[PDB]
Amino acid sequence: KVNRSTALLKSLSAERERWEKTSETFKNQMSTI
């Protein structure tokens, strides 16, 4: 379904930005150990 694909793409973009933020905070934690 097209709606399923669009929702999946939006959720995937959200997860991508979430994991970019998670990698940034992991780098910050590495800087402060």
Side-chain angles (χ1 to χ4, degrees):
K1 216 162 286 170
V2 52
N3 290 318
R4 270 69 169 168
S5 68
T6 56
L8 197 53
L9 262 293
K10 295 177 178 66
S11 54
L12 259 296
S13 298
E15 174 256 325
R16 272 299 172 275
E17 72 183 3
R18 274 217 305 109
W19 287 15
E20 181 69 29
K21 298 176 179 68
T22 304
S23 68
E24 190 65 88
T25 197
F26 266 33
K27 194 152 311 303
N28 193 7
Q29 203 157 340
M30 215 38 259
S31 80
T32 296
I33 188 74

PDB file of all heavy atoms in Angstrom:
ATOM      1  N   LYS A   1       0.825  -1.201   0.000  1.00  0.00           N
ATOM      2  CA  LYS A   1       0.000   0.000   0.000  1.00  0.00           C
ATOM      3  C   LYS A   1       0.864   1.258   0.000  1.00  0.00           C
ATOM      4  O   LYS A   1       1.940   1.284   0.598  1.00  0.00           O
ATOM      5  CB  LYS A   1      -0.940   0.004   1.207  1.00  0.00           C
ATOM      6  CG  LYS A   1      -2.306   0.607   0.925  1.00  0.00           C
ATOM      7  CD  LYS A   1      -3.322   0.191   1.976  1.00  0.00           C
ATOM      8  CE  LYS A   1      -3.735  -1.260   1.802  1.00  0.00           C
ATOM      9  NZ  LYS A   1      -4.549  -1.747   2.950  1.00  0.00           N
ATOM     10  N   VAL A   2       0.383   2.300  -0.683  1.00  0.00           N
ATOM     11  CA  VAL A   2       1.136   3.548  -0.762  1.00  0.00           C
ATOM     12  C   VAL A   2       1.165   4.247   0.594  1.00  0.00           C
ATOM     13  O   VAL A   2       2.190   4.818   0.991  1.00  0.00           O
ATOM     14  CB  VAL A   2       0.551   4.452  -1.865  1.00  0.00           C
ATOM     15  CG1 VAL A   2      -0.952   4.626  -1.686  1.00  0.00           C
ATOM     16  CG2 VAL A   2       1.256   5.801  -1.884  1.00  0.00           C
ATOM     17  N   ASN A   3       0.049   4.213   1.327  1.00  0.00           N
ATOM     18  CA  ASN A   3       0.010   4.832   2.650  1.00  0.00           C
ATOM     19  C   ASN A   3       0.987   4.154   3.601  1.00  0.00           C
ATOM     20  O   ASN A   3       1.670   4.823   4.387  1.00  0.00           O
ATOM     21  CB  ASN A   3      -1.410   4.780   3.213  1.00  0.00           C
ATOM     22  CG  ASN A   3      -2.361   5.704   2.480  1.00  0.00           C
ATOM     23  OD1 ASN A   3      -2.015   6.841   2.159  1.00  0.00           O
ATOM     24  ND2 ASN A   3      -3.568   5.220   2.213  1.00  0.00           N
ATOM     25  N   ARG A   4       1.061   2.821   3.546  1.00  0.00           N
ATOM     26  CA  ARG A   4       2.025   2.098   4.367  1.00  0.00           C
ATOM     27  C   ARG A   4       3.449   2.517   4.029  1.00  0.00           C
ATOM     28  O   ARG A   4       4.270   2.728   4.928  1.00  0.00           O
ATOM     29  CB  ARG A   4       1.857   0.589   4.177  1.00  0.00           C
ATOM     30  CG  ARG A   4       0.886  -0.079   5.142  1.00  0.00           C
ATOM     31  CD  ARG A   4      -0.552   0.340   4.889  1.00  0.00           C
ATOM     32  NE  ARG A   4      -1.495  -0.480   5.640  1.00  0.00           N
ATOM     33  CZ  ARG A   4      -2.782  -0.199   5.788  1.00  0.00           C
ATOM     34  NH1 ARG A   4      -3.319   0.885   5.252  1.00  0.00           N
ATOM     35  NH2 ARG A   4      -3.551  -1.026   6.490  1.00  0.00           N
ATOM     36  N   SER A   5       3.756   2.650   2.737  1.00  0.00           N
ATOM     37  CA  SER A   5       5.096   3.056   2.328  1.00  0.00           C
ATOM     38  C   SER A   5       5.425   4.462   2.817  1.00  0.00           C
ATOM     39  O   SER A   5       6.535   4.714   3.299  1.00  0.00           O
ATOM     40  CB  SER A   5       5.228   2.972   0.808  1.00  0.00           C
ATOM     41  OG  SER A   5       4.416   3.942   0.171  1.00  0.00           O
ATOM     42  N   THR A   6       4.475   5.393   2.699  1.00  0.00           N
ATOM     43  CA  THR A   6       4.724   6.761   3.147  1.00  0.00           C
ATOM     44  C   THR A   6       4.932   6.822   4.657  1.00  0.00           C
ATOM     45  O   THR A   6       5.850   7.502   5.138  1.00  0.00           O
ATOM     46  CB  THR A   6       3.572   7.674   2.729  1.00  0.00           C
ATOM     47  OG1 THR A   6       2.336   7.153   3.236  1.00  0.00           O
ATOM     48  CG2 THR A   6       3.493   7.774   1.212  1.00  0.00           C
ATOM     49  N   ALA A   7       4.090   6.119   5.420  1.00  0.00           N
ATOM     50  CA  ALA A   7       4.256   6.097   6.870  1.00  0.00           C
ATOM     51  C   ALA A   7       5.584   5.460   7.259  1.00  0.00           C
ATOM     52  O   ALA A   7       6.269   5.939   8.172  1.00  0.00           O
ATOM     53  CB  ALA A   7       3.090   5.353   7.521  1.00  0.00           C
ATOM     54  N   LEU A   8       5.963   4.380   6.571  1.00  0.00           N
ATOM     55  CA  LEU A   8       7.241   3.734   6.845  1.00  0.00           C
ATOM     56  C   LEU A   8       8.403   4.673   6.555  1.00  0.00           C
ATOM     57  O   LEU A   8       9.362   4.735   7.328  1.00  0.00           O
ATOM     58  CB  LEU A   8       7.362   2.454   6.020  1.00  0.00           C
ATOM     59  CG  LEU A   8       8.431   1.452   6.456  1.00  0.00           C
ATOM     60  CD1 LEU A   8       8.273   1.109   7.929  1.00  0.00           C
ATOM     61  CD2 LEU A   8       8.360   0.198   5.601  1.00  0.00           C
ATOM     62  N   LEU A   9       8.334   5.416   5.448  1.00  0.00           N
ATOM     63  CA  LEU A   9       9.408   6.350   5.118  1.00  0.00           C
ATOM     64  C   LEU A   9       9.511   7.468   6.149  1.00  0.00           C
ATOM     65  O   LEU A   9      10.617   7.858   6.544  1.00  0.00           O
ATOM     66  CB  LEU A   9       9.193   6.924   3.718  1.00  0.00           C
ATOM     67  CG  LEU A   9       9.980   6.262   2.585  1.00  0.00           C
ATOM     68  CD1 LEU A   9      11.469   6.524   2.748  1.00  0.00           C
ATOM     69  CD2 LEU A   9       9.703   4.769   2.530  1.00  0.00           C
ATOM     70  N   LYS A  10       8.370   8.000   6.595  1.00  0.00           N
ATOM     71  CA  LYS A  10       8.400   9.048   7.612  1.00  0.00           C
ATOM     72  C   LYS A  10       8.990   8.529   8.919  1.00  0.00           C
ATOM     73  O   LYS A  10       9.839   9.187   9.541  1.00  0.00           O
ATOM     74  CB  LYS A  10       6.994   9.606   7.835  1.00  0.00           C
ATOM     75  CG  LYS A  10       6.414  10.323   6.627  1.00  0.00           C
ATOM     76  CD  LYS A  10       4.992  10.788   6.888  1.00  0.00           C
ATOM     77  CE  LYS A  10       4.431  11.540   5.692  1.00  0.00           C
ATOM     78  NZ  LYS A  10       4.269  10.657   4.504  1.00  0.00           N
ATOM     79  N   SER A  11       8.560   7.338   9.346  1.00  0.00           N
ATOM     80  CA  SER A  11       9.103   6.753  10.569  1.00  0.00           C
ATOM     81  C   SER A  11      10.590   6.460  10.424  1.00  0.00           C
ATOM     82  O   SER A  11      11.356   6.602  11.383  1.00  0.00           O
ATOM     83  CB  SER A  11       8.335   5.481  10.930  1.00  0.00           C
ATOM     84  OG  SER A  11       8.317   4.571   9.844  1.00  0.00           O
ATOM     85  N   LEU A  12      11.018   6.053   9.227  1.00  0.00           N
ATOM     86  CA  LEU A  12      12.429   5.769   8.995  1.00  0.00           C
ATOM     87  C   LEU A  12      13.267   7.038   9.057  1.00  0.00           C
ATOM     88  O   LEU A  12      14.378   7.026   9.596  1.00  0.00           O
ATOM     89  CB  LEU A  12      12.604   5.068   7.650  1.00  0.00           C
ATOM     90  CG  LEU A  12      12.797   3.555   7.748  1.00  0.00           C
ATOM     91  CD1 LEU A  12      14.081   3.278   8.483  1.00  0.00           C
ATOM     92  CD2 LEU A  12      11.630   2.877   8.448  1.00  0.00           C
ATOM     93  N   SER A  13      12.759   8.141   8.505  1.00  0.00           N
ATOM     94  CA  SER A  13      13.470   9.413   8.614  1.00  0.00           C
ATOM     95  C   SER A  13      13.559   9.865  10.068  1.00  0.00           C
ATOM     96  O   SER A  13      14.601  10.365  10.519  1.00  0.00           O
ATOM     97  CB  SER A  13      12.779  10.475   7.757  1.00  0.00           C
ATOM     98  OG  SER A  13      12.792  10.112   6.387  1.00  0.00           O
ATOM     99  N   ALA A  14      12.466   9.696  10.820  1.00  0.00           N
ATOM    100  CA  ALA A  14      12.490  10.034  12.238  1.00  0.00           C
ATOM    101  C   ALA A  14      13.515   9.190  12.987  1.00  0.00           C
ATOM    102  O   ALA A  14      14.260   9.705  13.829  1.00  0.00           O
ATOM    103  CB  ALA A  14      11.099   9.857  12.845  1.00  0.00           C
ATOM    104  N   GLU A  15      13.573   7.891  12.688  1.00  0.00           N
ATOM    105  CA  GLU A  15      14.553   7.021  13.329  1.00  0.00           C
ATOM    106  C   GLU A  15      15.975   7.401  12.929  1.00  0.00           C
ATOM    107  O   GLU A  15      16.900   7.320  13.743  1.00  0.00           O
ATOM    108  CB  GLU A  15      14.259   5.562  12.980  1.00  0.00           C
ATOM    109  CG  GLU A  15      15.302   4.572  13.468  1.00  0.00           C
ATOM    110  CD  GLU A  15      16.208   4.092  12.354  1.00  0.00           C
ATOM    111  OE1 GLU A  15      15.722   3.943  11.214  1.00  0.00           O
ATOM    112  OE2 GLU A  15      17.406   3.863  12.617  1.00  0.00           O
ATOM    113  N   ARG A  16      16.166   7.819  11.675  1.00  0.00           N
ATOM    114  CA  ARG A  16      17.482   8.261  11.222  1.00  0.00           C
ATOM    115  C   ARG A  16      17.958   9.472  12.012  1.00  0.00           C
ATOM    116  O   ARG A  16      19.102   9.511  12.484  1.00  0.00           O
ATOM    117  CB  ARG A  16      17.437   8.579   9.727  1.00  0.00           C
ATOM    118  CG  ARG A  16      17.708   7.392   8.826  1.00  0.00           C
ATOM    119  CD  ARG A  16      19.092   6.824   9.081  1.00  0.00           C
ATOM    120  NE  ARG A  16      19.307   5.576   8.361  1.00  0.00           N
ATOM    121  CZ  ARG A  16      18.933   4.386   8.808  1.00  0.00           C
ATOM    122  NH1 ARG A  16      18.329   4.247   9.977  1.00  0.00           N
ATOM    123  NH2 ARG A  16      19.174   3.309   8.067  1.00  0.00           N
ATOM    124  N   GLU A  17      17.091  10.475  12.171  1.00  0.00           N
ATOM    125  CA  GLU A  17      17.501  11.655  12.931  1.00  0.00           C
ATOM    126  C   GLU A  17      17.674  11.322  14.412  1.00  0.00           C
ATOM    127  O   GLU A  17      18.578  11.852  15.074  1.00  0.00           O
ATOM    128  CB  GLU A  17      16.507  12.802  12.725  1.00  0.00           C
ATOM    129  CG  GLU A  17      15.161  12.641  13.403  1.00  0.00           C
ATOM    130  CD  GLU A  17      14.213  13.779  13.083  1.00  0.00           C
ATOM    131  OE1 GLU A  17      14.595  14.668  12.292  1.00  0.00           O
ATOM    132  OE2 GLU A  17      13.087  13.787  13.622  1.00  0.00           O
ATOM    133  N   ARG A  18      16.842  10.417  14.939  1.00  0.00           N
ATOM    134  CA  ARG A  18      16.999   9.981  16.323  1.00  0.00           C
ATOM    135  C   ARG A  18      18.348   9.313  16.541  1.00  0.00           C
ATOM    136  O   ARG A  18      19.017   9.561  17.549  1.00  0.00           O
ATOM    137  CB  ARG A  18      15.868   9.027  16.704  1.00  0.00           C
ATOM    138  CG  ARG A  18      14.606   9.710  17.195  1.00  0.00           C
ATOM    139  CD  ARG A  18      13.956   8.915  18.316  1.00  0.00           C
ATOM    140  NE  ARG A  18      13.691   7.533  17.933  1.00  0.00           N
ATOM    141  CZ  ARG A  18      14.351   6.484  18.403  1.00  0.00           C
ATOM    142  NH1 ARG A  18      15.331   6.620  19.280  1.00  0.00           N
ATOM    143  NH2 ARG A  18      14.020   5.266  17.981  1.00  0.00           N
ATOM    144  N   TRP A  19      18.769   8.462  15.605  1.00  0.00           N
ATOM    145  CA  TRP A  19      20.051   7.789  15.761  1.00  0.00           C
ATOM    146  C   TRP A  19      21.225   8.718  15.494  1.00  0.00           C
ATOM    147  O   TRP A  19      22.300   8.515  16.063  1.00  0.00           O
ATOM    148  CB  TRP A  19      20.129   6.563  14.854  1.00  0.00           C
ATOM    149  CG  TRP A  19      19.291   5.437  15.346  1.00  0.00           C
ATOM    150  CD1 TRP A  19      18.309   5.498  16.291  1.00  0.00           C
ATOM    151  CD2 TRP A  19      19.392   4.065  14.960  1.00  0.00           C
ATOM    152  NE1 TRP A  19      17.772   4.253  16.495  1.00  0.00           N
ATOM    153  CE2 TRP A  19      18.422   3.354  15.692  1.00  0.00           C
ATOM    154  CE3 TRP A  19      20.201   3.369  14.058  1.00  0.00           C
ATOM    155  CZ2 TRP A  19      18.239   1.985  15.548  1.00  0.00           C
ATOM    156  CZ3 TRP A  19      20.017   2.010  13.918  1.00  0.00           C
ATOM    157  CH2 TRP A  19      19.047   1.331  14.661  1.00  0.00           C
ATOM    158  N   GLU A  20      21.050   9.736  14.650  1.00  0.00           N
ATOM    159  CA  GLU A  20      22.078  10.768  14.551  1.00  0.00           C
ATOM    160  C   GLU A  20      22.263  11.477  15.888  1.00  0.00           C
ATOM    161  O   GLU A  20      23.396  11.687  16.343  1.00  0.00           O
ATOM    162  CB  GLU A  20      21.719  11.768  13.452  1.00  0.00           C
ATOM    163  CG  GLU A  20      22.747  12.872  13.260  1.00  0.00           C
ATOM    164  CD  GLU A  20      24.050  12.364  12.674  1.00  0.00           C
ATOM    165  OE1 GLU A  20      24.018  11.365  11.925  1.00  0.00           O
ATOM    166  OE2 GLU A  20      25.106  12.964  12.963  1.00  0.00           O
ATOM    167  N   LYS A  21      21.153  11.829  16.545  1.00  0.00           N
ATOM    168  CA  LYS A  21      21.243  12.444  17.867  1.00  0.00           C
ATOM    169  C   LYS A  21      21.868  11.489  18.881  1.00  0.00           C
ATOM    170  O   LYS A  21      22.648  11.907  19.745  1.00  0.00           O
ATOM    171  CB  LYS A  21      19.856  12.889  18.329  1.00  0.00           C
ATOM    172  CG  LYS A  21      19.225  13.945  17.438  1.00  0.00           C
ATOM    173  CD  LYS A  21      17.814  14.282  17.889  1.00  0.00           C
ATOM    174  CE  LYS A  21      17.199  15.356  17.006  1.00  0.00           C
ATOM    175  NZ  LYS A  21      16.951  14.858  15.624  1.00  0.00           N
ATOM    176  N   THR A  22      21.521  10.202  18.799  1.00  0.00           N
ATOM    177  CA  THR A  22      22.088   9.214  19.712  1.00  0.00           C
ATOM    178  C   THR A  22      23.591   9.062  19.503  1.00  0.00           C
ATOM    179  O   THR A  22      24.347   8.936  20.471  1.00  0.00           O
ATOM    180  CB  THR A  22      21.380   7.871  19.536  1.00  0.00           C
ATOM    181  OG1 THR A  22      19.970   8.044  19.722  1.00  0.00           O
ATOM    182  CG2 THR A  22      21.891   6.861  20.551  1.00  0.00           C
ATOM    183  N   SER A  23      24.043   9.066  18.248  1.00  0.00           N
ATOM    184  CA  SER A  23      25.475   9.014  17.980  1.00  0.00           C
ATOM    185  C   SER A  23      26.172  10.261  18.506  1.00  0.00           C
ATOM    186  O   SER A  23      27.283  10.181  19.043  1.00  0.00           O
ATOM    187  CB  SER A  23      25.727   8.846  16.483  1.00  0.00           C
ATOM    188  OG  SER A  23      25.347  10.009  15.768  1.00  0.00           O
ATOM    189  N   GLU A  24      25.533  11.425  18.363  1.00  0.00           N
ATOM    190  CA  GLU A  24      26.114  12.650  18.906  1.00  0.00           C
ATOM    191  C   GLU A  24      26.253  12.576  20.422  1.00  0.00           C
ATOM    192  O   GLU A  24      27.293  12.949  20.979  1.00  0.00           O
ATOM    193  CB  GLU A  24      25.269  13.857  18.501  1.00  0.00           C
ATOM    194  CG  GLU A  24      25.917  15.197  18.812  1.00  0.00           C
ATOM    195  CD  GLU A  24      27.178  15.438  18.005  1.00  0.00           C
ATOM    196  OE1 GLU A  24      27.074  15.976  16.883  1.00  0.00           O
ATOM    197  OE2 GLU A  24      28.274  15.092  18.496  1.00  0.00           O
ATOM    198  N   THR A  25      25.218  12.089  21.112  1.00  0.00           N
ATOM    199  CA  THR A  25      25.303  12.011  22.569  1.00  0.00           C
ATOM    200  C   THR A  25      26.271  10.919  23.013  1.00  0.00           C
ATOM    201  O   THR A  25      26.898  11.045  24.071  1.00  0.00           O
ATOM    202  CB  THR A  25      23.914  11.806  23.186  1.00  0.00           C
ATOM    203  OG1 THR A  25      23.960  12.136  24.580  1.00  0.00           O
ATOM    204  CG2 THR A  25      23.439  10.372  23.040  1.00  0.00           C
ATOM    205  N   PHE A  26      26.436   9.861  22.215  1.00  0.00           N
ATOM    206  CA  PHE A  26      27.454   8.860  22.518  1.00  0.00           C
ATOM    207  C   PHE A  26      28.854   9.436  22.360  1.00  0.00           C
ATOM    208  O   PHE A  26      29.750   9.137  23.158  1.00  0.00           O
ATOM    209  CB  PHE A  26      27.270   7.634  21.626  1.00  0.00           C
ATOM    210  CG  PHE A  26      26.451   6.547  22.256  1.00  0.00           C
ATOM    211  CD1 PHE A  26      25.421   6.855  23.129  1.00  0.00           C
ATOM    212  CD2 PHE A  26      26.712   5.216  21.978  1.00  0.00           C
ATOM    213  CE1 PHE A  26      24.667   5.857  23.711  1.00  0.00           C
ATOM    214  CE2 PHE A  26      25.960   4.215  22.557  1.00  0.00           C
ATOM    215  CZ  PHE A  26      24.936   4.535  23.425  1.00  0.00           C
ATOM    216  N   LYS A  27      29.063  10.265  21.334  1.00  0.00           N
ATOM    217  CA  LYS A  27      30.339  10.958  21.195  1.00  0.00           C
ATOM    218  C   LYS A  27      30.584  11.890  22.374  1.00  0.00           C
ATOM    219  O   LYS A  27      31.709  11.990  22.876  1.00  0.00           O
ATOM    220  CB  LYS A  27      30.377  11.733  19.878  1.00  0.00           C
ATOM    221  CG  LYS A  27      31.765  12.205  19.478  1.00  0.00           C
ATOM    222  CD  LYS A  27      31.892  12.339  17.969  1.00  0.00           C
ATOM    223  CE  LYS A  27      31.393  11.093  17.254  1.00  0.00           C
ATOM    224  NZ  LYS A  27      32.115   9.868  17.697  1.00  0.00           N
ATOM    225  N   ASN A  28      29.537  12.585  22.826  1.00  0.00           N
ATOM    226  CA  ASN A  28      29.673  13.449  23.996  1.00  0.00           C
ATOM    227  C   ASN A  28      30.042  12.642  25.237  1.00  0.00           C
ATOM    228  O   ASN A  28      30.891  13.064  26.031  1.00  0.00           O
ATOM    229  CB  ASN A  28      28.377  14.227  24.225  1.00  0.00           C
ATOM    230  CG  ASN A  28      28.546  15.365  25.214  1.00  0.00           C
ATOM    231  OD1 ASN A  28      29.656  15.663  25.652  1.00  0.00           O
ATOM    232  ND2 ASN A  28      27.439  16.006  25.572  1.00  0.00           N
ATOM    233  N   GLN A  29      29.409  11.481  25.422  1.00  0.00           N
ATOM    234  CA  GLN A  29      29.742  10.621  26.554  1.00  0.00           C
ATOM    235  C   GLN A  29      31.178  10.121  26.463  1.00  0.00           C
ATOM    236  O   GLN A  29      31.880  10.033  27.479  1.00  0.00           O
ATOM    237  CB  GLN A  29      28.768   9.446  26.626  1.00  0.00           C
ATOM    238  CG  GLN A  29      28.652   8.816  28.004  1.00  0.00           C
ATOM    239  CD  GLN A  29      27.341   8.082  28.201  1.00  0.00           C
ATOM    240  OE1 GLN A  29      26.366   8.326  27.491  1.00  0.00           O
ATOM    241  NE2 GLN A  29      27.310   7.174  29.171  1.00  0.00           N
ATOM    242  N   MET A  30      31.630   9.776  25.255  1.00  0.00           N
ATOM    243  CA  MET A  30      33.024   9.387  25.064  1.00  0.00           C
ATOM    244  C   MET A  30      33.967  10.527  25.422  1.00  0.00           C
ATOM    245  O   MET A  30      35.037  10.301  25.997  1.00  0.00           O
ATOM    246  CB  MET A  30      33.251   8.939  23.620  1.00  0.00           C
ATOM    247  CG  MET A  30      34.254   7.802  23.441  1.00  0.00           C
ATOM    248  SD  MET A  30      34.207   6.532  24.721  1.00  0.00           S
ATOM    249  CE  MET A  30      35.615   6.997  25.725  1.00  0.00           C
ATOM    250  N   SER A  31      33.589  11.761  25.081  1.00  0.00           N
ATOM    251  CA  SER A  31      34.419  12.910  25.426  1.00  0.00           C
ATOM    252  C   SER A  31      34.513  13.104  26.933  1.00  0.00           C
ATOM    253  O   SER A  31      35.527  13.605  27.431  1.00  0.00           O
ATOM    254  CB  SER A  31      33.871  14.174  24.763  1.00  0.00           C
ATOM    255  OG  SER A  31      32.771  14.694  25.491  1.00  0.00           O
ATOM    256  N   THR A  32      33.478  12.715  27.675  1.00  0.00           N
ATOM    257  CA  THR A  32      33.430  12.896  29.124  1.00  0.00           C
ATOM    258  C   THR A  32      33.328  11.516  29.773  1.00  0.00           C
ATOM    259  O   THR A  32      32.240  11.029  30.087  1.00  0.00           O
ATOM    260  CB  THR A  32      32.244  13.805  29.502  1.00  0.00           C
ATOM    261  OG1 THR A  32      32.452  15.111  28.950  1.00  0.00           O
ATOM    262  CG2 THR A  32      32.112  13.927  31.002  1.00  0.00           C
ATOM    263  N   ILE A  33      34.484  10.872  29.950  1.00  0.00           N
ATOM    264  CA  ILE A  33      34.577   9.597  30.643  1.00  0.00           C
ATOM    265  C   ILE A  33      35.638   9.617  31.737  1.00  0.00           C
ATOM    266  O   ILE A  33      35.414   9.091  32.833  1.00  0.00           O
ATOM    267  CB  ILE A  33      34.824   8.432  29.655  1.00  0.00           C
ATOM    268  CG1 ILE A  33      34.726   7.086  30.375  1.00  0.00           C
ATOM    269  CG2 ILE A  33      36.153   8.587  28.923  1.00  0.00           C
ATOM    270  CD1 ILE A  33      33.311   6.679  30.716  1.00  0.00           C
TER     271      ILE A  33
END
